[PDB]
């Protein structure tokens, strides 16, 4: 089960020149390309090893499209300003995301194309990739623009079509990287509070993909409430970390069980003190 | 609907001229193309929106502006001979994307000097006896001759009003002396009616040739009459 | 970004299924158009597709195939009123985020009409005396003479919409002959009165 995803960001700098624009490309949880308006190359650049093979006609075409994004966002910042009746003194952000998910068999599953203005949803392609979601009258203008231009259809044509082929190309071209599976090197510590309680932190390190589940179960019943859980983070080497943690009454420290689920484990783990 | 103005225009080399293009369709993209035999259709400049402009395949010798949304002027500071072309303005609702709507075309000739501009002469020729007798129809031939450049529009008028049926005009003119490029042109047409209608002498057949030449804004210093824009005609009455 | 396209002219008889092609090499073309331009007029849209497949406007069929890189237009039931130059065009995203519209050189189509009862003749007309080759057959071809001081023009189809009648005619003139004018063209034995 796989996916390709492009994230795109533009941040306006009123008074201080053109808006900063960064775009980045993912396969599952792996970065394979980037573009930054503020670097020297002004070229789409690679970030995985397996992508560097692609000839000059590849990077050309990407750099061509990425710059087009760039420009659109610039134009889009100014427009959106007007649909909201905003002035020219504030810094504003536009964010676009699109990509396509596959299944075990590498066949099309789901598609998405999402646009967010200032950090809230603006317009997105719905599930069927046939309509649009207007969270505004301002976005209502945009929808009309796109509806008439038949954008859905063409993005559908890309999201179902071109998207899955190249992802097929990518997973293929890097199988020794992308379709790997690193399992949670699972842990567990114990700490004090004030002579009276103690914390059980269920650790999980060095896994890939980043998708994991850490739940806690007291007396065979999960302890939804009263529990601390951090966001998965990157180690910085292609692998992820996470931990969950609970405070248990001193001397019950052994009735508590942590449940670690990840597609890299044959059997979902169970852990106890 | 896209508008160009003017639709014809002659200039000597060197005089700055401008072709203005217009549209109240609320499109944001406008561009200018030229069309030349064999080269096809080449973009010159375009503009994705107001205050936004950019070079095309062939920008050299041309400049534009996009001060207002609804107009995209094409400006030639110093005309060259070989800027002689058919110039089309096209508009697009957004970015240049999807369909592009074309202007009706501006025909342009830039001459070495205006010595070479001659108004057409017109001459109708009347049906053949044998043509009537054999087929029971009547073909008139009109003949434009000796004109430069081919900025001409032929038309047939039957009793004061225009008429389109039974008319054929040659799609292309017909260089009178092909060995030169300072060469005047000839162009023919045909109208055709039933015998009886032609043999009715109370029927007026007139061929009309509209020539787009110089304006009274163009410097003349030859002995002969300035070949200004003008209509030239020739007339025939039905013989019973 | 290059489009090749047979220049023409393709002569066909009324009723013939015309096929027009453009091949291209740019992988990046997203919009594909067929324009019809009628001599001394501004191109006008005929078909538009953004996607692969086949679209249809009755007599008209457009085919895009991104694999062969092949744009096709089929006019079934050719008619006289379809004599035009047909331009193909394709547009590709540029880095300024404009779409650039690149045009093929254009194919001239001339669709011949069926002369029901060909009555070929060469008339002398009452006044550079003027000769008229007329009523000849649509599948006969008229050629510009070798005598430099004579003027032969191509065949021209006129139509009398009210009388369900169509005929062909060429014009020759010089400052004579009118028996020697069209000898340079290959004319049916039928044609002098």
């Amino acid at each position: 089960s796989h996916s390709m995803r492009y994230f795109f960001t533009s941040v306006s700098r009123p008074g201080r020149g053109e808006p900063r624009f960064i775009a980045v490309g993912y396969v599952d949880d792996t970065q394979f390309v980037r573009f930054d308006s503020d670097a020297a190359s002004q070229r789409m650049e690679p970030r995985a090893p397996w992508i560097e093979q692609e000839g000059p006609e590849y990077w050309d075409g990407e750099t061509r499209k990425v710059k087009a994004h760039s420009q659109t966002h610039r134009v889009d910042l100014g427009t959106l300003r007007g649909y909201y009746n905003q002035s020219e003194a504030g810094s504003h952000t536009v964010q676009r995301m699109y990509g396509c998910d596959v299944g075990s068999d590498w066949r099309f599953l789901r598609g998405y194309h999402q646009y967010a203005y200032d950090g809230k949803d603006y317009i997105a392609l719905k599930e069927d990739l046939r309509s649009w979601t207007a969270a505004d009258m301002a976005a209502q203008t945009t929808k009309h623009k796109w509806e008439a231009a038949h954008v859905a259809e063409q993005l559908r044509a890309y999201l179902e079509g071109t998207c899955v082929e190249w992802l097929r190309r990518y997973l293929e071209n890097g199988k020794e990287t992308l379709q790997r599976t690193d399992a949670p090197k699972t842990h567990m510590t114990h700490h004090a509070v004030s002579d009276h309680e103690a914390t059980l932190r269920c650790w999980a390190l060095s896994f890939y993909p980043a998708e994991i589940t850490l739940t806690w179960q007291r007396d065979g019943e999960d302890q939804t409430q009263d529990t601390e859980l951090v966001e998965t983070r990157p180690a910085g080497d292609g692998t992820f970390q996470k931990w969950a943690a609970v405070v248990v009454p001193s001397g019950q420290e052994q009735r508590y069980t942590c449940h670690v689920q990840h597609e890299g484990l044959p059997k979902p783990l169970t852990l106890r003190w | 609907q896209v508008t160009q103005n003017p639709r014809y225009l002659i200039t000597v080399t060197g005089k700055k001229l401008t072709v203005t293009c217009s549209q109240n369709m609320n499109h944001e993209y406008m561009s200018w193309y030229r069309q030349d035999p064999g080269l096809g259709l080449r973009q010159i400049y375009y503009s994705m929106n107001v205050e936004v402009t950019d070079k095309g395949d062939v920008p050299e010798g041309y400049k534009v502006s996009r001060k207002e949304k609804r107009n995209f002027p094409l400006i030639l500071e110093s005309p060259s001979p070989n800027q002689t072309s058919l110039y089309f303005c096209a508009s697009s609702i957004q970015q240049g994307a999807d369909t592009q709507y074309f202007g009706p075309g501006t025909r342009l000739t830039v001459l070495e000097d205006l010595k070479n501009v001659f108004p057409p002469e017109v001459a109708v020729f009347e049906p053949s006896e044998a043509e009537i007798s054999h087929t029971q129809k009547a073909t008139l031939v009109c003949l434009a001759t000796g004109f430069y450049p081919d900025h001409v529009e032929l038309s047939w008028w039957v009793n004061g009003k225009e008429v389109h049926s039974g008319v054929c005009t040659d799609p292309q003119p017909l260089k009178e002396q092909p060995a030169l490029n300072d060469s005047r042109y000839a162009l023919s047409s045909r109208l055709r009616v039933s015998a009886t209608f032609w043999q009715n002498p109370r029927n007026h057949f007139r061929c009309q040739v509209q020539f787009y030449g110089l304006s009274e804004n163009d410097e003349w210093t030859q002995d002969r009459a300035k070949p200004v824009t003008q209509i030239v005609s020739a007339e025939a009455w039905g013989r019973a | 970004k290059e489009v090749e396209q047979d220049p023409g002219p393709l002569s066909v008889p009324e009723g013939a299924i015309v096929s027009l092609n453009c091949t291209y090499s740019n992988s990046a073309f997203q919009y594909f158009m067929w324009y019809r331009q009628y001599s001394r007029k501004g191109p006008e849209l005929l078909m538009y597709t953004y996607s692969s497949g086949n679209k249809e406007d009755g007599r008209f069929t457009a085919q895009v195939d991104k694999s062969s890189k092949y744009i096709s237009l089929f006019i079934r039931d050719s008619q006289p009123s379809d004599s035009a130059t047909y331009l193909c065009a394709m547009s590709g995203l540029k880095e300024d985020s404009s779409y650039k519209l690149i045009f093929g050189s254009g194919t001239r189509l001339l669709v011949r009409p069926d002369i029901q009862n060909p009555d070929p003749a060469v008339y002398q007309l009452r006044d550079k005396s003027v000769c008229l080759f007329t009523d000849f057959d649509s599948q006969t071809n008229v050629s510009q003479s070798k005598d430099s001081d004579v003027y032969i023009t191509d065949k021209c189809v006129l139509d009398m919409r009210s009388m369900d009648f169509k005929s062909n005619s060429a014009v020759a003139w010089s400052n004579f002959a009118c028996a020697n004018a069209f000898n340079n063209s290959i004319i049916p034995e039928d044609t002098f009165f």
């Binding site: 490309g25 087009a68 994004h69 603006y122 203008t141 954008v151 998207c163 | 994307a97 | 990046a28 997203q30």
Partner: peptide
């Protein structure tokens, strides 16, 4: 491979 449908809003 990125998309070629980039349209303004």
């Amino acid at each position: 491979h990125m998309t070629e449908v980039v349209r303004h809003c």
